[PDB]
């Protein structure tokens, strides 16, 4: 589990979104495994605006933060999970690092702030749904 709290927005894995998230929907995209809902309070997260390929991610199944190199956001074929058949998971970044299904929601961060959240994890290893293209997260 995990979310990004930026301004009055909550960014979660679409497959972990709650009823309250869907009842307060701002934007969702199945292809990206992302959903954004509204919050009453303002959030303490700075989204990165950058093309970094190095950062650190939180891995709940290790209680550890790991430094990683990651690929730029792309349309990877992702192998079937419980929540998606496979499709081309878009805006996905892959690193070499451990992950399990429950690790979805761990922040990846660079020197500029939050890059994305764990979403996928194949043999390739850990995939992070990028949020850095979502400029609108910073305004209104
Ligand atoms: C971070 C992450 C996300 C998903 C997965 N696992 C899968 O997609 C499938 C489900 C059944 C066995 O593997 N592993 C890691
Ligand atoms: Zn950066």
Keywords, please?
140 residues; mainly beta; 2 domains; seven-stranded antiparallel sheet; binds (2S)-N-(5-methylpyridin-2-yl)oxolane-2-carboxamide; binds zinc ion; hydrolase; Diamond Light Source; I03; asap; Coxsackievirus A16
In short:
The chain is mostly beta strands and 140 residues long. It has two domains: 3-44, no CATH class; 45-140, no CATH class.
Small molecules bound: (2S)-N-(5-methylpyridin-2-yl)oxolane-2-carboxamide, zinc ion
Which shape, going by the Cα principal axes?
globular
Strand content: over 45%
Give the number of DSSP strands. 10
Largest sheet: 7 strands, antiparallel
Our measurement of the CA-to-CA distance between the termini, rounded to an integer number of angstroms, reads 26 Å
Strand order of the largest sheet: 5-4-8-9-10-7-6
Helix content: under 10%
Rg, rounded, reads 14 Å
Total discrete domains: 2
Could you spell the SSE succession in H and E letters?
EHEEEEEEEEE
Structural class by helix and strand composition = mainly beta
Number of helices: 1
PDB class: hydrolase
Keywords: Diamond Light Source, I03, asap, Coxsackievirus A16, crystallographic fragment screening, PanDDA, Pandda2, XChemExplorer, viral protein, hydrolase
Assembly: monomeric
Entry title: Group deposition for crystallographic fragment screening of Coxsackievirus A16 (G-10) 2A protease -- Crystal structure of Coxsackievirus A16 (G-10) 2A protease in complex with Z71580604 (A71EV2A-x0416)
């Amino acid at each position: 589990s995990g979310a990004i709290y930026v301004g009055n927005y909550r960014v979660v894995n679409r497959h972990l979104a709650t009823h309250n998230d869907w009842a307060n929907l701002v934007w969702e995209d199945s292809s990206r495994d992302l959903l954004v809902s509204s919050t009453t309070a303002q959030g303490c997260d700075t989204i990165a605006r950058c093309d970094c390929q190095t950062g650190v991610y939180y891995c709940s199944s290790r209680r550890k933060h790991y430094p990683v190199s990651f690929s730029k956001p792309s349309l990877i074929f992702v192998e079937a999970s419980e929540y998606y058949p496979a499709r081309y998971q878009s805006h996905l970044m892959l690193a070499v690092g451990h992950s399990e299904p429950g690790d979805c929601g761990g922040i990846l961060r660079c020197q500029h702030g939050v890059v994305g959240i764990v979403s996928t994890g194949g043999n390739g290893l850990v995939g992070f749904a990028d949020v850095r293209d979502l400029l609108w997260l910073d305004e209104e």
